[PDB]
Amino acid sequence: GVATQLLAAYILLFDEYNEKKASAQKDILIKVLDDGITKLNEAQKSLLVSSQSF
């Protein structure tokens, strides 16, 4: 839910090249992707342990 709105904001605000919010945008993208990948990997491993439990 957060990811899809952040990326839409990226497409909308950077249709063109604004140089001012260029540097902040890379930080935002790095932060959200480094969060989400960790989230997904932990969820998959938890689901695997839950599957093995039976």
């Binding site: 695997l48 599957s51 093995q52 039976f54």
Partner: protein, 54 residues
Amino acid sequence: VIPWQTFDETIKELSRFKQEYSQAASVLVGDIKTLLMDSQDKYFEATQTVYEWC
């Protein structure tokens, strides 16, 4: 003239054979089924991880 005691004791030993062997067998069969499902899960995880990298 009807050795019914000996008859019954024979039946006891005969049944006791099959009791012991069913007892010994089904546990190990269940162990096999467990290992089969575990190897399946490991396989699924490994293949999934490879595919997601590729």
